Amino acid sequence: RYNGLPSMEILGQAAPGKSTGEAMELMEQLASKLPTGVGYDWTGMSYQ
């Protein structure tokens, strides 16, 4: 659970050449095209 709600932590890293900002931007885009009632958030290093 993350912030009281049920969750699943997903880890990954930016591909060779690409930055973390570019990588995180695509994860947001892919997360938007998920089923109804499925949100997301950034934690740990991705929060800071």
Add this chain to the structure above:
Amino acid sequence: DGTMTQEDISDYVAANMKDAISRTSGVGDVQLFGSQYAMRIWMNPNEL
């Protein structure tokens, strides 16, 4: 759209909104103007 009653809204606010809002940056105390849904067992003393 008159799909949710007064207490239907209160349940959603209590269950989905209140907890997340109560942990928000700078929020002190959160008073729900309503009540979260409980399993109400309305006893009938004649049948009882």
